[PDB]
Assembly symmetry: C3
Homo-oligomer: 314 residues x 3
C-alpha cells in the first residue's frame, strides 16, 4: 500500500502560535525516512501553502472563520485526491481544526469511514457553545450530521457537508470536556472512553470494545485523528492545551498498534505538536519523538519487533 | 444535599511541622469556590482552634497524647453536630490522627458507616506497637472494637469509643506496613488492597470488590479517609511520609469518582498535605491541586464532563 | 535457606564505562544489611577480580571476546560452587554479558532450571547478527542450544555449553528488538511478553501465564536475570541503554513478588546499573535504590507488610 504525507502548517485554529511549525519538526525528526523503512510506500506531498484571508472579521465569537474555512477547504481537496488514488493519507498538524478538512476529503472517497478520535478534549463545541472562538475546539461539530442546522452558518465553511453521524465516531482519552460539549455528547449518544473508562477497563478492553462497536457489522475504513494532547503532558509537553492524568506513552502506542493490526487504517492526523511551547529542548524533542513514534506504530512497527519476510537471518 | 468544610489545623499527630497549614493551602487553592460550582450546597464551618495542653508529657512512647486527644475530642463534636443536621462533612488535614475525631463524631450519627481508607499506610499501630509515639500512625487502633483493651488507656482519649469493627473498614493503596501493623491486619482479618492487589486486579476491579464487600448486604453511609500519601510521591510530593510505588493521579480520581457514583458519601478526610515540605513551589502547588481535585471528584466532577440539567446548550 | 551475593565488576560487555562500579553502589545502598533483615541467611562472597586478557583483538565484530569469555568462565565457576552447597546465588552486575557465566554455573548444578528474563532487550544477537560487537547484547545466544553451531566459535567462550532450550526461557518487558533478534525469537518460538503484551494482559495475567508455561508440568529451579533497563528510564535512569515505555516500578516489584511467592528462586542477576550515567545524584540513587528494592522483593519483602512469626506484637 501507498502512504502520502501532507503537511498542514496551520494555526489560526487557536490563539497560540507555533503549531504551524509542527509538520516541519516532525519531518526534521525524520518521520519520512523512518516511514520508508516500513512495509509501505512513502510519498511526501509536501506542505500546503495556505492563503490568508485579508480582513477576516470574527463571526460573533468564532475567530478567523474564513481563514480556517479556506485552509480546510483546500485540505479536504488534497486529501480526497490522494485518497482517490488509493493511498492512505497522513496529515501533520498545525492545530486540530484541520481535522474538518482532513476528515471531509477522506469522507468524500470513503463515506462509510468511522472515526477514532484520540484526544484529551472532545472538540465538539459549536459556534454557539464555545467560550473562545478557537475553531480547533469545534472540529467534530462541523463534521457531525446530528449537529447540522444547530448553529448559524459560518463564514468560509459553506463548503462543508456533515459526513458522519454520532454512530461512527469513538473518543479515547477524554478528560477536559466543557459543559456544553458534555451535553452534546450525551444527548447524541456518542460512544467514548473517558480516562475514567480507560482506568476502569484498561487500554486493552477499550480497543476491543471500540472495534466491535465500530467494525462489528461492516468492516469499514478507519480515520485516526490523533491529538498529541491525549497523552499525559509528561510525554507530550510541547502542546497548546496540556491536561494532566491522560494516556501513557505505552497506552498511546497500544492504540496505534491495535489499529495497525486491523489493517483498515485509511487516514491519519498527528495534530497539536507545537515546537515552540517546549519549556526546554528536551520537552519538544520529547514531544516530537513520541509523535513520530505513534505514527510509525500505525504502519507496522511493533514493540515486540519486526523482521523482513522471506529473509533467513540465520 | 449540604456540604460542610471543617478545617482541622492540627499537627501534633507527628513530629514534622507544617501540616497545620494544610487546610489553609487547600482553601487558597480555592476548594470552596470550586465546590460551590458543583450540585452541592457548600458551607464553610471554618478552622477549629485547638487548645494546647500545657505540659503534655509522653505516655510511654505515645507523644502529645493529651493535645491529640483534646484536638480529636473537639472535632468529633463538630462533626457529629453537622452530620446531625444532615450535611456531609469534609475535614481538611493537618495530620491523619484527626481521623479518630472525624470518624468518631460521624459514627455517633451514623453507627453503621463503613470506612474506606485510601492511604500509603495502615496507621493501625497501638501505643504498644509504634516505634515512634506519633499518633498519626495509630488512628485506626483507637477506632477499632477488636483492639479495645489491647492497649493501655491513653491520656486524653478517654472519650473515644471503638465505633467500627474490622468488618467495616477497607484499605486501598497499602505499601508501608510495620511488622506489628501487618500482624494486626492479618489477625483481625481486615479487608485491604495493597499496591500489589491494585497491580494484580486493576483499580477497577478493586472498587467493584470493596463495594460488594462493604455494601453487598446493607447500603450504609461511607466514610472516606483519604491520606494524600496514598498517591505516588510524584503526584503528591509535599507530604511527611512519601512512599514510592503508589496510586497514580488517575487511579486516585477513579476511586473518588466511583465513590461519588454510589451516592453514599457521608464524610471525607483530605489529610497529610504539608505545604512546607515542598522541595519547590511546584511540588506544593502540585500536591495542593491534586488534593483539591480528588475532593471535587467525590462531589460530582466527572472526568468525562459535566453539564447542568434542564439546560439546552443548543 | 542460604543467600550468596557475588559481585561481578565487569564492563567489557559494552563500550560504556562505569557498570563495573555497579556492585559497589548496590552494596553502598546497603543491599547486604537489608537482605540480612529478611528470613534468609546472607553470605557476601565479595567481588570477583577479573584478569584482563592482554591484546584482546576483535573476533570480527565481537569485541573483547577473550576478556568476556574469561570473566564469564570464572563466574560460572563461582556460581556452580555456591549453588552446589545449596545456596541461592545473587550476581550483581556490571553489564549483562555476565549472564552467560551466571546462568552457566547455575545450569551445571540445576540443568532443569527455567529462565525468566526481565529486560527491555532480548540480548539474543549472535556474533553474526550484532551491529556492534558488544557481547552484552548476545548473552542468550551463547546459552541457547537451538543456536549452537549457528555461529563461529568465539575466542574465549570455548568453555560454554548451551544449557537451556528456547522452551525454558521467558522474556518480560521487551521493546527494543533488533530485526535479526526478532527473527531468532520468532523462528525458535521463544515465549515472551513484549510491552504490548503487558499492556494488553496486565502484569498480573503475564506472570500467571509465564508460570503455568514454565512450571505447569515440572516445578523446577528458576533463574531470574533481571536487567534494570527493563523498567521505564524514569525509574532506573542511570543505565547504558534506556528505552522508554517500559515496566513501571510497581510492575517490576510485582514480578519479583510473584517470583518470591513460587519459592523456586534459585539464582538472580541485578544487571546494568551504571552509577556514572546518572544525569544527577538523584537519578543514580533513584536507580540504585529500585535495584536494591527489587532484590529484597525476590526474598520476602512484601508490599503489604511483613511480621516475624511466633511473635505476638500485642
Ligand atoms: Mn483536539
Ligand atoms: Mn485536545
Ligand atoms: Mn494516614
Ligand atoms: Mn500515610
Ligand atoms: Mn540485557
Ligand atoms: Mn537491556
Amino acid at each position: 500500500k501507498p502512504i502520502e504525507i501532507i503537511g498542514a502548517p496551520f494555526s489560526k485554529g487557536q490563539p497560540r502560535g507555533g503549531v504551524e511549525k509542527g509538520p516541519a519538526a516532525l519531518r526534521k525528526a525524520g518521520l519520512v525516512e523512518k516511514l520508508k523503512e516500513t512495509e509501505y510506500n512513502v510519498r511526501d506531498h509536501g506542505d500546503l501553502a495556505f492563503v490568508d484571508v485579508p480582513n477576516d472579521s470574527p463571526f460573533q465569537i468564532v475567530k478567523n472563520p474564513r481563514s480556517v474555512g479556506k485552509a480546510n477547504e483546500q485540505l479536504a481537496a488534497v486529501v480526497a485526491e490522494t485518497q482517490k488514488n488509493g493511498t492512505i493519507s497522513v496529515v501533520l498538524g498545525g492545530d486540530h481544526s484541520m481535522a474538518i478538512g482532513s476528515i471531509s476529503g477522506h469522507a468524500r472517497v470513503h463515506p462509510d469511514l468511522c472515526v477514532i478520535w484520540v484526544d484529551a478534549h472532545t472538540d465538539i463545541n459549536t459556534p454557539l457553545t464555545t467560550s473562545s472562538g478557537n475553531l480547533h475546539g469545534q472540529p467534530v461539530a462541523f463534521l457531525l450530521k446530528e449537529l447540522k442546522g444547530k448553529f448559524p452558518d459560518v463564514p468560509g465553511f459553506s463548503w462543508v457537508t456533515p459526513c458522519i453521524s454520532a454512530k461512527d465516531i469513538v473518543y479515547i482519552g477524554l478528560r477536559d470536556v466543557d459543559p456544553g460539549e458534555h451535553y452534546i455528547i450525551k444527548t447524541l449518544g456518542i460512544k467514548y472512553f473517558s480516562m475514567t473508562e480507560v482506568d476502569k477497563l484498561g487500554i486493552g478492553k477499550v480497543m476491543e470494545e471500540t472495534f466491535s462497536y465500530l467494525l462489528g457489522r461492516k468492516k469499514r475504513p478507519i480515520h485516526l485523528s490523533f491529538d498529541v494532547e491525549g497523552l499525559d503532558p509528561v510525554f507530550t509537553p510541547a502542546t497548546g492545551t496540556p491536561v494532566v492524568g491522560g494516556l501513557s506513552y505505552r497506552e498511546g502506542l497500544y492504540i496505534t498498534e491495535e489499529i495497525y493490526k486491523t489493517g483498515l487504517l485509511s487516514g491519519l492526523d498527528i495534530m497539536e505538536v507545537n515546537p515552540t511551547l517546549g519549556k526546554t529542548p528536551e520537552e519538544v524533542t520529547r514531544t516530537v519523538n513520541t509523535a513520530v513514534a505513534l505514527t510509525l506504530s500505525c504502519f507496522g512497527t511493533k514493540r515486540e519487533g519486526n523482521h523482513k519476510p522471506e529473509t533467513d537471518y540465520l
